[PDB]
Design a protein around this ligand. Structure first.
Ligand SMILES: CC(C)C[C@H](CC(=O)NO)C(=O)N[C@@H](CC(C)C)C(=O)N[C@@H](Cc1ccccc1)C(N)=O
Ligand SMILES: [Ca+2]
Ligand SMILES: [Zn+2]
Ligand SMILES: [Zn+2]
Length: 166
């Protein structure tokens, strides 16, 4: 497990993400919105303030890809999960690859570029793996994607209470 205290591998409580690429299916624009939303309430919980790439490097950068790349999770094509992501520090710091195999969709999900985002974004920092109802860890895209107040994992939130160092 990652996270805490005084935050992960960042000396800022004002971070960023970067959709390196953005597969133009949701569209690219609604894929940015799938991510950017996820981000938004992750910044209500911790003291952090996430946003898209202010400059330089980021926290969790993401590229789309996995039509069948073969990293972690499965390139399963449109439908299923999709992110074959791995941790903050390890990978292009906070690395996640989202099935460009999909045709991003939010038809309940099918696949929506939003939870690959949540799973990734929460995965990197340290709100990484649990088992609840609403959590980023509630483990199969049919989520509580009401990202107005998504209310992340309550356990992996106890790690966002670290991000929250200040
Ligand atoms: C983003 C979050 C939802 C990821 C979860 C849980 C997780 O944290 N795994 O590490 C997941 O990977 N679930 C996969 C496991 C594996 C394939 C990587 C799954 O059950 N996927 C469904 C996809 C799905 C989606 C909608 C309807 C039906 C089925 C499946 N392959 O049966
Ligand atoms: Ca898939
Ligand atoms: Zn990959
Ligand atoms: Zn996971």
């Amino acid at each position: 497990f990652r996270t805490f205290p005084g935050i992960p591998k960042w000396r800022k409580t004002h971070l960023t993400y970067r959709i390196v690429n953005y597969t133009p299916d949701l569209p690219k624009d609604a894929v940015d919105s799938a991510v950017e939303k996820a981000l938004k309430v992750w910044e209500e919980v911790t003291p952090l303030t996430f946003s898209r790439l202010y400059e330089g490097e980021a926290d969790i950068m993401i590229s789309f890809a996995v039509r069948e790349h073969g990293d972690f999770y499965p390139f399963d094509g449109p439908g299923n999960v999709l992110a074959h992501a791995y941790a903050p520090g390890p990978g292009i710091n906070g690395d996640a690859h989202f099935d460009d195999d999909e045709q991003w969709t939010k038809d309940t999900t099918g696949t929506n570029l939003f939870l690959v985002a949540a799973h990734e974004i929460g995965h990197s920092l340290g709100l990484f793996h649990s088992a609840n109802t609403e959590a980023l860890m509630y483990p199969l895209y049919h989520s509580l994607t009401d990202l107005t107040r998504f209310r992340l994992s309550q356990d992996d939130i106890n790690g966002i209470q670290s991000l929250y160092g200040p």
